[PDB]
mmCIF file of C-alpha atoms and ligand atoms in Angstrom:
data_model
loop_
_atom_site.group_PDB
_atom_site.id
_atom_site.type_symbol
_atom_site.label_atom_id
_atom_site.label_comp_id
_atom_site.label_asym_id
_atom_site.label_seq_id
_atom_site.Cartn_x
_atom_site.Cartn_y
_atom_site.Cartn_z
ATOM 1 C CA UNK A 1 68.737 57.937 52.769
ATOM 2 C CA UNK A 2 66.737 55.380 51.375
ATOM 3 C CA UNK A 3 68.357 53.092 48.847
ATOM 4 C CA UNK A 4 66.157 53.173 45.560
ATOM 5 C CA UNK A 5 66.782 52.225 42.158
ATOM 6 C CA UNK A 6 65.871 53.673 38.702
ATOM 7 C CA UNK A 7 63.742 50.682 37.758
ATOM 8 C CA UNK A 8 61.025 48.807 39.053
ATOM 9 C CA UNK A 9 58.722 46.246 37.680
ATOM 10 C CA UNK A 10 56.735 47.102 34.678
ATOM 11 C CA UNK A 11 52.838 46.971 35.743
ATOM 12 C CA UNK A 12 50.520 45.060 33.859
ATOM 13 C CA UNK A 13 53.721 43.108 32.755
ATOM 14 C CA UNK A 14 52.556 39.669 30.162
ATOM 15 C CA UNK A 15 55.667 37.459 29.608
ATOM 16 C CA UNK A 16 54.233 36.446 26.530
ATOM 17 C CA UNK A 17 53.627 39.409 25.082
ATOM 18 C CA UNK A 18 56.784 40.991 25.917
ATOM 19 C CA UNK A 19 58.340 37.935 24.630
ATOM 20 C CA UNK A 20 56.629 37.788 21.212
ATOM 21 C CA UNK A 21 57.396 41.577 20.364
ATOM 22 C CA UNK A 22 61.127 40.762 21.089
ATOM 23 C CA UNK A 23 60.714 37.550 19.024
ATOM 24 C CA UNK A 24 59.315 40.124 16.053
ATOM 25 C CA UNK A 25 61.802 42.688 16.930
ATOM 26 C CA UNK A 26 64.866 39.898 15.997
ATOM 27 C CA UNK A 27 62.112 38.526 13.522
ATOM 28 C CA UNK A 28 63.731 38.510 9.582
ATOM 29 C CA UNK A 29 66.547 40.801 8.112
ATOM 30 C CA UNK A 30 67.173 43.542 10.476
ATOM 31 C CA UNK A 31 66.629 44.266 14.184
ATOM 32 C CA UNK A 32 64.094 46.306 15.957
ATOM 33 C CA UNK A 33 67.068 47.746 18.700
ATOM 34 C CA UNK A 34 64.931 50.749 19.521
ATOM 35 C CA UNK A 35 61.731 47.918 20.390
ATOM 36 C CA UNK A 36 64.578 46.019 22.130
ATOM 37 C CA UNK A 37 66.341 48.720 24.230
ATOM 38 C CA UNK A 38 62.832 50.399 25.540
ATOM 39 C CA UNK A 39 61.093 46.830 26.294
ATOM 40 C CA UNK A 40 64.137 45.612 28.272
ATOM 41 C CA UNK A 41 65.168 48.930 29.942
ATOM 42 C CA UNK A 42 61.228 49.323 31.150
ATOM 43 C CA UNK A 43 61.107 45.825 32.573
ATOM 44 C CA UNK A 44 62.794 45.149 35.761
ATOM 45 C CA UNK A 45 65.789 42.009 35.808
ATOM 46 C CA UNK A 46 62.989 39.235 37.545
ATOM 47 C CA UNK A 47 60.755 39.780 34.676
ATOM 48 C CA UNK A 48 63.184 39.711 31.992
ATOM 49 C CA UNK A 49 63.897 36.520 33.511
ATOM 50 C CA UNK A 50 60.238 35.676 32.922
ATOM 51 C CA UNK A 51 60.269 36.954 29.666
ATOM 52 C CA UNK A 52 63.069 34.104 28.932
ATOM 53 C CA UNK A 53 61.201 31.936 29.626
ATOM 54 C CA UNK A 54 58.440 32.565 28.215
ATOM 55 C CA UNK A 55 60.488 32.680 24.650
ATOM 56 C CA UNK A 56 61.432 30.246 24.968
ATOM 57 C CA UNK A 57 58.386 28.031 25.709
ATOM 58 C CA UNK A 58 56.587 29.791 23.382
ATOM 59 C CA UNK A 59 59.220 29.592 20.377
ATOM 60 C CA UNK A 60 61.830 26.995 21.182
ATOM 61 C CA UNK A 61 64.512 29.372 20.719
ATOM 62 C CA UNK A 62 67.152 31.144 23.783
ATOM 63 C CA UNK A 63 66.391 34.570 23.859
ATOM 64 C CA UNK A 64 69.950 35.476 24.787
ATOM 65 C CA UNK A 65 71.244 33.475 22.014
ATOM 66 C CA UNK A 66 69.180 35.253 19.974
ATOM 67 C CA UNK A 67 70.248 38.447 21.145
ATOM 68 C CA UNK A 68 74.066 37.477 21.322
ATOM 69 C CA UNK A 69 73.961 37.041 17.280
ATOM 70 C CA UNK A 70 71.249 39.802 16.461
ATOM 71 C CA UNK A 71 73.391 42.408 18.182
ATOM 72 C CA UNK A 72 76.952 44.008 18.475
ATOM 73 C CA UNK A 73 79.473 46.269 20.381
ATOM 74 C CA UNK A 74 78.597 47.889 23.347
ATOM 75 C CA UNK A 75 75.011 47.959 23.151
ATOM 76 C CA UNK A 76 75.240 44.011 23.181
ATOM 77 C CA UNK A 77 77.393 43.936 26.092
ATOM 78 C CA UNK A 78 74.580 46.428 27.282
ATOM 79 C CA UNK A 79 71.720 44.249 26.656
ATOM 80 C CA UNK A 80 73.436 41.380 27.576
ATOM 81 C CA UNK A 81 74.451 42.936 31.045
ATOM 82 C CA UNK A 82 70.698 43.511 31.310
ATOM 83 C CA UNK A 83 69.868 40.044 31.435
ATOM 84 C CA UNK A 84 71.913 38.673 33.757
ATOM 85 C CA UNK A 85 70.184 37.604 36.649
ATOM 86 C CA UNK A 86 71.184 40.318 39.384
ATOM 87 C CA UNK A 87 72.081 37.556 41.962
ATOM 88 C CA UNK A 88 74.771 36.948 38.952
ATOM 89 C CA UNK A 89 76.216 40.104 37.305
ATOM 90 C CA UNK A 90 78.467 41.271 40.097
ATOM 91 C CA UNK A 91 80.587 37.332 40.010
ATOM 92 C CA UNK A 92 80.174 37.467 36.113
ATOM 93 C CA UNK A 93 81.842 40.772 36.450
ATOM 94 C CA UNK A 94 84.443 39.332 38.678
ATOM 95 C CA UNK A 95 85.013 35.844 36.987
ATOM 96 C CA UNK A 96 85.574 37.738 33.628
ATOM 97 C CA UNK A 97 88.142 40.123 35.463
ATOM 98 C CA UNK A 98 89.822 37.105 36.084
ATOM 99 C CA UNK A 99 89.668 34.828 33.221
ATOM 100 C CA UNK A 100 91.538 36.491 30.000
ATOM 101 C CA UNK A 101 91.785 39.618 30.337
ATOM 102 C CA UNK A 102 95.272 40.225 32.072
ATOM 103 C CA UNK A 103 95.178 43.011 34.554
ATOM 104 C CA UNK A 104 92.214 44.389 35.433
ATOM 105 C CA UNK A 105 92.253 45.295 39.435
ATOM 106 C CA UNK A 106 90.035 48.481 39.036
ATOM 107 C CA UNK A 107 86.843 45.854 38.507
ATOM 108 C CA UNK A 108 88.105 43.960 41.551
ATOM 109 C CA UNK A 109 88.328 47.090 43.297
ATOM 110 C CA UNK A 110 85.202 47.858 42.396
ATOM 111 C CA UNK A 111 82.676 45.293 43.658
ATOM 112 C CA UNK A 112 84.881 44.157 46.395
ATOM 113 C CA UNK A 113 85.327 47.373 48.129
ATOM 114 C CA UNK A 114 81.919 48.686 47.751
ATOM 115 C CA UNK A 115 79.583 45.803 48.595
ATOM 116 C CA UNK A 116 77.856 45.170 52.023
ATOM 117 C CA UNK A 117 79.296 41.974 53.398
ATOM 118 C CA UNK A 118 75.776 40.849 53.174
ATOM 119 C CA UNK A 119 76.540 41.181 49.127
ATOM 120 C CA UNK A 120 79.986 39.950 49.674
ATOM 121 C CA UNK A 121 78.785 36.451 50.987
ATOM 122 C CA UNK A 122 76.080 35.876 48.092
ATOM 123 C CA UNK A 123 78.299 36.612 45.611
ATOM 124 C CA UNK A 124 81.406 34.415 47.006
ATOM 125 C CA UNK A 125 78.082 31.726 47.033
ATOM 126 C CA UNK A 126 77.239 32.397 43.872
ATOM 127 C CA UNK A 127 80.407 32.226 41.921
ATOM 128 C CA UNK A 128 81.339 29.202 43.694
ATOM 129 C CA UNK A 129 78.558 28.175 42.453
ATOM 130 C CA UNK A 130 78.678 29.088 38.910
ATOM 131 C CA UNK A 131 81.703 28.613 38.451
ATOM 132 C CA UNK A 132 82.658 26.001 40.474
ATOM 133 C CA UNK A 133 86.032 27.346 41.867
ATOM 134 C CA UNK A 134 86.437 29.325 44.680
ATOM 135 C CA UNK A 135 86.371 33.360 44.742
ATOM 136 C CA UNK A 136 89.044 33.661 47.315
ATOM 137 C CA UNK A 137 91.057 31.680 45.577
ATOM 138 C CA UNK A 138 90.748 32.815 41.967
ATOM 139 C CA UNK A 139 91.615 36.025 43.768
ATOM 140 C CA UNK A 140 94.852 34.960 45.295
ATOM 141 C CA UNK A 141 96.121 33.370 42.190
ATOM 142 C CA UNK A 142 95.422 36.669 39.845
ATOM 143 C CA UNK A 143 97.073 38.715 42.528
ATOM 144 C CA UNK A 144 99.836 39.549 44.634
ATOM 145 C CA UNK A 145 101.212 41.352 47.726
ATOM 146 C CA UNK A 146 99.179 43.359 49.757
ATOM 147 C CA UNK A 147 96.155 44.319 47.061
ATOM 148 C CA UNK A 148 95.828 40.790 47.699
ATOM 149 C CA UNK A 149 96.232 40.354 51.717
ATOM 150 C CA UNK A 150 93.325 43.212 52.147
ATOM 151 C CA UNK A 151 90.850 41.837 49.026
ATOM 152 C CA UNK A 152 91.504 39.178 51.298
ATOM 153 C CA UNK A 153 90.448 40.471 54.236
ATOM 154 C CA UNK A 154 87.869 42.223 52.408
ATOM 155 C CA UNK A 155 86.095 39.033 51.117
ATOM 156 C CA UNK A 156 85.488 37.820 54.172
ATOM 157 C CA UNK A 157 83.601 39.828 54.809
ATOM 158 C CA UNK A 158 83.534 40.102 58.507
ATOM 159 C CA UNK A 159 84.101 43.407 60.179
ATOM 160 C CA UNK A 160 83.385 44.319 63.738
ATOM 161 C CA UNK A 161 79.522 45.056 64.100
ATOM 162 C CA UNK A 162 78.155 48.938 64.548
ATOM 163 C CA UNK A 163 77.541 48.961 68.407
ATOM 164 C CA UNK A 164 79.767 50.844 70.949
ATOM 165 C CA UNK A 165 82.399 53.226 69.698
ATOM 166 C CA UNK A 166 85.647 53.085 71.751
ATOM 167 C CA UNK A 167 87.437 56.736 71.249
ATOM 168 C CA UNK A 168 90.365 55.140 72.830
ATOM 169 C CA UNK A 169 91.064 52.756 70.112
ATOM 170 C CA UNK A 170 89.525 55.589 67.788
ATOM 171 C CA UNK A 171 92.523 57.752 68.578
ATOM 172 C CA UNK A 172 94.675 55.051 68.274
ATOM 173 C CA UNK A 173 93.554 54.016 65.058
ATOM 174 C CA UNK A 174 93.700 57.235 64.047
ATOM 175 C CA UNK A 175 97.319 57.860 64.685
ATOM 176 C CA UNK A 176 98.387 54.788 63.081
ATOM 177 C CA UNK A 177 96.945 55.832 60.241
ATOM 178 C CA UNK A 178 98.575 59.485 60.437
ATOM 179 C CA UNK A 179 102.232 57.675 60.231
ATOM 180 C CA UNK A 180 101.188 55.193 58.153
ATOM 181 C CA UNK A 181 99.801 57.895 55.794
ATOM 182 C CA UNK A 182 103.522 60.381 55.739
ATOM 183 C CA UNK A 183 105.172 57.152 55.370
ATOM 184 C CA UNK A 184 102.967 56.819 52.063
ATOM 185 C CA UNK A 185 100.803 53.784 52.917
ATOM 186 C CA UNK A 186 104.328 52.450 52.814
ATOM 187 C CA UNK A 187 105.268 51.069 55.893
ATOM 188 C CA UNK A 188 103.527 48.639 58.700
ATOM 189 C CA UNK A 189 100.739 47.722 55.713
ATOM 190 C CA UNK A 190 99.453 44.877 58.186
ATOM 191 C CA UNK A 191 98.691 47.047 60.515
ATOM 192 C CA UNK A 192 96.514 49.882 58.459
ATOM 193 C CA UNK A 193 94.861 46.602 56.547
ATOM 194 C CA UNK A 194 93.372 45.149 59.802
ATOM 195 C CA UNK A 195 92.113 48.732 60.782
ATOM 196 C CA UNK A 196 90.449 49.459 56.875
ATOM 197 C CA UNK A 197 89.306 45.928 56.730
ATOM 198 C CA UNK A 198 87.745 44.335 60.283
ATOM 199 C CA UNK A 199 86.930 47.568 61.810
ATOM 200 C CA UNK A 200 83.209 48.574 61.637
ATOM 201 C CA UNK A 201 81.959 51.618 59.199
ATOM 202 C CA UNK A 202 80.728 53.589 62.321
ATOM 203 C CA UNK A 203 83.772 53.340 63.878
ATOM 204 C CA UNK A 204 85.976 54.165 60.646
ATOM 205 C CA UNK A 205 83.889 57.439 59.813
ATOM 206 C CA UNK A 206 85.092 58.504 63.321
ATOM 207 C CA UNK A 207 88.538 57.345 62.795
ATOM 208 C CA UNK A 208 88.617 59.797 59.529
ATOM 209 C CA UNK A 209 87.244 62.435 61.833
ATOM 210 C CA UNK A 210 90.147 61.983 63.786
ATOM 211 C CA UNK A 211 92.507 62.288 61.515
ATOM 212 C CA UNK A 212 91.351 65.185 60.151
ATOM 213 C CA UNK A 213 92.162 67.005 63.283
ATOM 214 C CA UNK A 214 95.483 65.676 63.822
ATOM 215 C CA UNK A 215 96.519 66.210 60.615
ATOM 216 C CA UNK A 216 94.433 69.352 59.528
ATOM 217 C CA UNK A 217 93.510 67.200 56.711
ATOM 218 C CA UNK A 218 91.083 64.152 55.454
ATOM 219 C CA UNK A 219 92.990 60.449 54.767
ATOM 220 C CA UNK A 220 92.308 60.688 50.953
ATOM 221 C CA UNK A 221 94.138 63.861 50.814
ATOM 222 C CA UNK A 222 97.223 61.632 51.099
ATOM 223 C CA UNK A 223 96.818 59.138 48.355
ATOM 224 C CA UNK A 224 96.416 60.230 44.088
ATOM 225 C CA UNK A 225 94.040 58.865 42.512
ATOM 226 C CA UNK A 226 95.821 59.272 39.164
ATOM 227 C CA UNK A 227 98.804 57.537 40.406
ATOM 228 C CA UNK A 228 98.797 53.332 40.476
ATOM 229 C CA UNK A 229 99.579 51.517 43.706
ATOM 230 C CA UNK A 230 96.882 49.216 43.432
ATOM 231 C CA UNK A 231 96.738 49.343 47.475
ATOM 232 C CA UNK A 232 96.202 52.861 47.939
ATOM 233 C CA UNK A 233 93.091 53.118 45.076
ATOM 234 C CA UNK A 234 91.824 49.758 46.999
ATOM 235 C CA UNK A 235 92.441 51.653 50.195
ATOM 236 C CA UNK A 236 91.118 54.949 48.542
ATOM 237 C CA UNK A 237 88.059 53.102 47.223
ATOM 238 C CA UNK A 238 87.416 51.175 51.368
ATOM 239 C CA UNK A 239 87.640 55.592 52.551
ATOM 240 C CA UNK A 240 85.132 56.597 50.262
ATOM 241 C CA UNK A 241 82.754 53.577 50.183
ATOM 242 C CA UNK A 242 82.941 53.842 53.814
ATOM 243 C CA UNK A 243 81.415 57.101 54.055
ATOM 244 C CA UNK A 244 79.026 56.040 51.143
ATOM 245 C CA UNK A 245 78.667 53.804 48.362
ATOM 246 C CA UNK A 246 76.765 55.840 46.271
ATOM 247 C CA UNK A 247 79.020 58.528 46.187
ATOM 248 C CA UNK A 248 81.979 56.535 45.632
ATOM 249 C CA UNK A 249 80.068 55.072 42.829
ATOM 250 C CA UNK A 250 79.081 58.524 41.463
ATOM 251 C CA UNK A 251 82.339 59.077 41.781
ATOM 252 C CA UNK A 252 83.551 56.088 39.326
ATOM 253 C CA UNK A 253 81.236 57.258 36.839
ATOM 254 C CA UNK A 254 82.129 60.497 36.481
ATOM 255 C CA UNK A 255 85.931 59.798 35.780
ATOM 256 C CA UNK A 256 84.323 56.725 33.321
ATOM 257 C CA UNK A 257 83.757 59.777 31.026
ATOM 258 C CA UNK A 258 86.160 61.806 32.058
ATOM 259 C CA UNK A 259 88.598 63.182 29.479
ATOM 260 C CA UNK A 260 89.797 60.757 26.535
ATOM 261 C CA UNK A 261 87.929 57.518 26.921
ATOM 262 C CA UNK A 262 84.424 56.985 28.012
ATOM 263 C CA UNK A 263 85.241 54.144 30.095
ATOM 264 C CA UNK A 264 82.148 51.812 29.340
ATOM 265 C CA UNK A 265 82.564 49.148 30.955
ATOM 266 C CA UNK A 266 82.638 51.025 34.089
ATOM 267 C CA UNK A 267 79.614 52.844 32.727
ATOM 268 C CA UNK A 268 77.767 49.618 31.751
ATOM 269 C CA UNK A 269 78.691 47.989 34.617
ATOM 270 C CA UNK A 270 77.472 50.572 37.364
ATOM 271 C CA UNK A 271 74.731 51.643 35.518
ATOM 272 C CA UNK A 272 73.632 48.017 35.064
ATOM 273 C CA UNK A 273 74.350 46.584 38.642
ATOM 274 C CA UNK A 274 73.032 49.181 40.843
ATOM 275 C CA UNK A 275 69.831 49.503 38.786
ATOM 276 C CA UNK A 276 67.281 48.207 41.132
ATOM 277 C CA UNK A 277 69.464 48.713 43.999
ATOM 278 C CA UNK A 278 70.964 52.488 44.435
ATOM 279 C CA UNK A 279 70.839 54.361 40.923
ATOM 280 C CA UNK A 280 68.295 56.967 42.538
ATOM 281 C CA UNK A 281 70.937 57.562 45.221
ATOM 282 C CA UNK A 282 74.111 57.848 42.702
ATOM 283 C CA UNK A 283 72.025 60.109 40.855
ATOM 284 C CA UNK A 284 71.376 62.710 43.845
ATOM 285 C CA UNK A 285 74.973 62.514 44.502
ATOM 286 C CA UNK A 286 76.195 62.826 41.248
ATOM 287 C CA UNK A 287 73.849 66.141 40.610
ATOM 288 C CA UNK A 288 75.412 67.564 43.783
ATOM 289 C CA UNK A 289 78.761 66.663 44.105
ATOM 290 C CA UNK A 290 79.673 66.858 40.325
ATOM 291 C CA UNK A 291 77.290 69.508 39.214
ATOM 292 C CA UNK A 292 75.878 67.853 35.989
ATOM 293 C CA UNK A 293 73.377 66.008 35.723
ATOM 294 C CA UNK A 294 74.519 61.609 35.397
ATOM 295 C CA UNK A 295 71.917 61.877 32.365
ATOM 296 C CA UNK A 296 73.436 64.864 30.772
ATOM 297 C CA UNK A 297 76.942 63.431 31.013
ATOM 298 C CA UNK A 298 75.747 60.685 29.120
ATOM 299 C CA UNK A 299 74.195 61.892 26.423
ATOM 300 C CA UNK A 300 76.808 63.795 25.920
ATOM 301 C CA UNK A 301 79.903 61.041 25.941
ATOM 302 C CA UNK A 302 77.984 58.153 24.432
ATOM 303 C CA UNK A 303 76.087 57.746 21.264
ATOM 304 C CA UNK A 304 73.797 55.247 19.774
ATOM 305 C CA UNK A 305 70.911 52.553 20.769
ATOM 306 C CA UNK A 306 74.076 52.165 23.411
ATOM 307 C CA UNK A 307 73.322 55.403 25.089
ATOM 308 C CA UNK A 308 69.145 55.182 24.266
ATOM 309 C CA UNK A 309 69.448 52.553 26.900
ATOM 310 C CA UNK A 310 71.850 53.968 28.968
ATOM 311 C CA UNK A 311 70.020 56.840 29.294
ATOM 312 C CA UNK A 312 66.495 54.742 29.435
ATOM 313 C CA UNK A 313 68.335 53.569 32.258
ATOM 314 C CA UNK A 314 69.173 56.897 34.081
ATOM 315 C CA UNK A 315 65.794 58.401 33.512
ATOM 316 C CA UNK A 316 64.888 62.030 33.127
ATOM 317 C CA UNK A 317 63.565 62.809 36.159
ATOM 318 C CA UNK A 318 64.849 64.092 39.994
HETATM 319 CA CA1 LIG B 401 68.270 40.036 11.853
HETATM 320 CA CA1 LIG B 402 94.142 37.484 34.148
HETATM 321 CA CA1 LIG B 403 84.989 61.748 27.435
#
């Protein structure tokens, strides 16, 4: 493994020019979407940011205000994903989960269970930041029980650091997530929270081993995904981002399609926030553990300028 994206910055790049074809592209009665989508989707995030600026020096006018009344439906909320600042999109994603619309745990889920505490600090920075109250406790408002207590202990972000593995407490951990697991995730939830939560990833994977031979069978074997119980798809989501991140978020995007619904805001979210990050990985493990290609899927459940980008973004290549 080494984390890659699917895009990098555009060489030979000119701000200005890139920001005059968009300024044609929006230019009179009718949009340019196709010029739009393939400029935007073949620059990287820091140079649409340049790009910006560059519009706006040049014409006096806010490119995403432009944008916001040239464009509709998803492909807007596409485009518009695309230009927010990278160092932004994960606490927009989470400040919007938050604000209006009512219950929606499966984006808090999301982020919060597969970032690197790293990402977990910047972004609780960030929102404060932007938004001026505090993540934490936006979080605890909008949510109850013990979802809450472990997004909680999630955010922050401080588990044990990857250095000696102690196969006592490994077995220990292990068993008290054995009972824990036959009594549904249902009893002693303090307990299996401070194990999912503050112990390190190192030491987890082992833990999982050791279930596995205690019980004949793997800890996710003993949740449903289909099912509710915030909790357990929080505690699902901490098993599987803890053996990898990009699986668990191939994963997410292959049930975004699945069935009735393409789930696109899961699509444009992942898609859009692990662009320059991990898409490269997501992609290898989609392909593999899924058997379609990410691309294919795509082109296949979307439709539009919406999936021109989309796929733009994937990329038709390994
Ligand atoms: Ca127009
Ligand atoms: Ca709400
Ligand atoms: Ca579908």
């Amino acid at each position: 493994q080494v984390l890659r994206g699917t895009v990098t910055d555009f060489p030979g790049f000119d701000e200005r020019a890139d920001a005059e074809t968009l300024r044609k592209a929006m230019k009179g009665l009718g949009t340019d979407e196709e010029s739009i989508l393939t400029l935007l989707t073949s620059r990287s995030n820091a140079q649409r940011q340049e790009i910006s600026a560059a519009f706006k020096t040049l014409f006096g006018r806010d490119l995403l205000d432009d944008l916001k009344s040239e464009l509709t439906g998803k492909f807007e909320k596409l485009i518009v994903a695309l230009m927010k600042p990278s160092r932004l999109y994960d606490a927009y994603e989470l400040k919007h989960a938050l604000k209006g619309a009512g219950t929606n745990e499966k984006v808090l889920t999301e982020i919060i269970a597969s970032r690197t505490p790293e990402e977990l600090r910047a972004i609780k920075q960030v929102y404060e930041e932007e938004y001026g109250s505090s993540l934490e406790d936006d979080v605890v408002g909008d949510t109850s029980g013990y979802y809450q207590r472990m997004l909680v202990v999630l955010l922050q972000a401080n588990r044990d650091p990857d250095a000696g593995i102690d196969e006592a407490q490994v077995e220990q951990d292990a068993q008290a997530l054995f009972q824990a697991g036959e009594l549904k995730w249902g009893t002693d939830e303090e307990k299996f929270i401070t194990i999912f939560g503050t112990r390190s990833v190192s030491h987890l994977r082992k833990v999982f081993d050791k279930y596995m031979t205690i019980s004949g069978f793997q800890i996710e074997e003993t949740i449903d995904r289909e099912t509710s119980g915030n909790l357990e798809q929080l505690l699902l989501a901490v098993v599987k981002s803890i053996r990898s991140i990009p699986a668990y978020l191939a994963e997410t995007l292959y049930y975004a399609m699945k069935g009735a619904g393409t789930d696109d805001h899961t699509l444009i979210r992942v898609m859009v926030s692990r662009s320059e990050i991990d898409l490269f990985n997501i992609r290898k493990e989609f392909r593999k553990n899924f058997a379609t290609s990410l691309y294919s899927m795509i082109k296949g459940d979307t439709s539009g300028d919406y999936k021109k980008a989309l796929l733009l973004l994937c990329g038709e290549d390994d």
